[PDB]
């Protein structure tokens, strides 16, 4: 099964308690990853609650980072908001 979230819902997850963001229409819960990110937590907090696909691709993440990112996926963006 697949869980779909709307932009309205995702936008609410941008506080000290929860950090979500969108990458290629998939929703990632990075709340517990913030402090482990070698690229820092500041760059993640700034994108919280929205689509960070361009910024993610602009820095050119390695294959290992992309494979790891999959562990944080909690769903996808609702088709109606795409
Ligand atoms: C979705 C989970 C993500 C994972 C698992 C992840 C993982 C990593 C890892 C392992 C690196 C080291 C370099 C590499 O292996 O490519 C890295 C560097 C970096 N990441 Fe991420 N990243 C994620 C999301 C993001 C996002 C959304 C942004 C931007 C909004 C971001 C910005 C950066 C920056 C700025 C660097 C450092 C680049 C440099 O030093 O030149 N990352 N990330």
UniProtKB/Swiss-Prot annotation:
Q: What subcellular locations does the record give?
A: Endoplasmic reticulum membrane; Microsome membrane
What is this protein for, i.e. what is its function? Cytochrome b5 is a membrane-bound hemoprotein functioning as an electron carrier for several membrane-bound oxygenases.
Q: Which residues of the full protein are shown?
A: 8 to 89 of 134
The protein in question is named: Cytochrome b5
Question: Belongs to which family?
Answer: Belongs to the cytochrome b5 family.
Q: Does the keyword Heme apply?
A: yes
Q: How does it sit in the membrane?
A: Single-pass membrane protein
Specify where it is mainly localized: endoplasmic reticulum
The Gene Ontology CC terms held by the record are: endoplasmic reticulum membrane; intracellular membrane-bounded organelle
Residues with the modification N6-acetyllysine, per the entry, are 3, 12
Q: What is the lineage of its organism?
A: Eukaryota, Metazoa, Chordata, Craniata, Vertebrata
**Molecular functions per Gene Ontology:** heme binding; metal ion binding
Q: Where is the Cytochrome b5 heme-binding domain?
A: 2-78
Residues binding heme: 37, 61
Q: Which organism is it from?
A: Bos taurus (Bovine)
Per UniProt, which keywords does this protein have? Acetylation, Electron transport, Endoplasmic reticulum, Heme, Iron, Membrane, Metal-binding, Microsome, Transmembrane, Transmembrane helix, Transport
């Amino acid at each position: 099964a697949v869980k779909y979230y709307t932009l309205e819902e995702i936008q609410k997850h941008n506080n000290s308690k929860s950090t979500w963001l969108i990458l290629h229409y998939k929703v990632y819960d990075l709340t517990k990853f913030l402090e482990e990110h070698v690229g820092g937590e500041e760059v993640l907090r700034e994108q919280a609650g929205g689509d960070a696909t361009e910024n993610f691709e602009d820095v050119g993440h390695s294959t290992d980072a992309r494979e790891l990112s999959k562990t944080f996926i909690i769903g996808e963006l609702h088709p109606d908001d795409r």
